[PDB]
Design a protein around this ligand. Structure first.
Ligand SMILES: [Fe+2]
Ligand SMILES: [O-]
Ligand SMILES: [Zn+2]
Length: 349
RNA sequence: ACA
């Protein structure tokens, strides 16, 4: 029994073209797509006003296709899980920093998170690395003065994700830019013949944040995009795969993984516990996280009986199943934070 | 389409 998982590189607002090429895969091969994974640059602009938050050169200031799906004029045929890249409607993703559906069958994993589906544990890391913004907190509500910084990966995601491989392994991990140094772990001489600009960066190419997470979690697969080219490498037990952008080949590949059981999209229990136990660092809605707290220290308070109480309370107020919510993203920001605060306060710690 |  096999599940077929589609992995997609940069979309850049060409959703109808992506789904057309996914639909033709099913009709030409006869295989069924379980769900779709996207590595970022989604450009989930609801309407014209969201163009302010799209940090791209002037020639790429385009609405794209997402608004057709947001308005219900188009319907995504497959469940699509994605992270954020550097070309995003960054205000939308900040409202959904704890993850959420931007529209039917399109689920944003948030700034970072782990999810469950078909017996798999999938980790996502949004954004691209810039050293001068890795210590910067998020300010809320989103402001046009932060269009240049909202998509930069923060350092604190390392401490948020480092313990996720204690109970069981991670099957798939998602990042937009490559883990730093991974370029040297494949056929880099061939990559340089096709992308001569990558050679000057050497082993420093990519994100050091994603390098640390890869070495810590060591998932079965690490999938990245951003660089608009095909690449594959092996970092110990981890299969690295990079994908191009929609409109060109090597933008979509397919993982054929064993299917232990078919299961709906669910929150990862270990991630849910991390989310609740770090609430004090995120309790100030106007600026988070407050790194006067130590994320590691907050997470060191996890116990077996506390984790059991959190899942019981999470299932009560939110539920283990990740279900579609059509409230406006500012309402979902407040709603999800309301129940994280409520669960934490009922733990009495 | 890093900036
Ligand atoms: Fe990108
Ligand atoms: O990209
Ligand atoms: Zn791209």
């Amino acid at each position: 029994q096999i599940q077929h998982i589609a992995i997609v590189g940069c979309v850049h607002g060409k959703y109808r073209e992506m789904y057309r090429q996914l639909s033709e895969y099913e009709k030409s091969t006869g295989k069924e797509i379980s769900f779709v994974i996207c590595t970022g640059d989604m450009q989930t602009l609801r309407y014209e006003a969201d163009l302010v938050y799209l940090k791209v050169p002037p020639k790429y200031k385009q609405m794209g296709d997402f608004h057709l799906y947001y308005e219900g004029k188009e319907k995504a045929p497959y469940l699509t899980l994605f992270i954020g890249g550097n070309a995003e409607s960054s205000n939308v993703l900040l409202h959904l920093y704890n993850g959420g559906f931007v529209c039917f069958n399109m689920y944003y994993l948030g700034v970072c998170s782990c999810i469950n589906i078909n017996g798999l544990r999938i980790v996502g890391v949004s954004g691209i690395y810039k050293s001068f913004d890795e210590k910067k907190p998020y300010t809320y509500p989103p402001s046009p003065n932060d269009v240049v910084s909202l998509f930069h990966t923060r350092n604190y995601v390392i401490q948020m994700l480092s313990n996720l491989s204690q109970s069981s392994q991670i099957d798939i991990s998602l990042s937009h830019d490559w883990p730093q140094g991974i370029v040297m772990k494949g056929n880099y001489k061939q990559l340089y013949r096709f992308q001569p600009g990558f050679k000057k960066d050497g082993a420093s190419l990519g994100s050091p944040i994603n390098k640390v997470i890869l070495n810590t979690l060591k998932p079965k697969y690490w999938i990245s995009g951003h660089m608009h080219c095909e690449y594959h490498a092996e970092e110990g037990p981890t299969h690295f795969i990079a994908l191009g952008k929609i409109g060109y080949k090597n933008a979509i590949s397919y993982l054929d993984l064993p299917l232990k059981q078919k299961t709906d999209l669910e929150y990862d229990k270990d991630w849910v516990c991390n989310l609740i136990m770090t609430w004090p660092a995120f309790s100030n809605k106007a600026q988070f996280p407050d790194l006067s707290y130590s994320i590691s220290e907050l997470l060191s308070k996890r116990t077996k009986e506390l984790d059991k109480k959190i899942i019981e309370l999470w299932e009560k107020y939110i539920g283990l199943k990740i279900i579609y919510d059509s409230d406006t993203f500012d309402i979902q920001f407040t709603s999800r934070r309301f129940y994280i605060e409520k669960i934490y306060n009922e733990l009495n710690i």
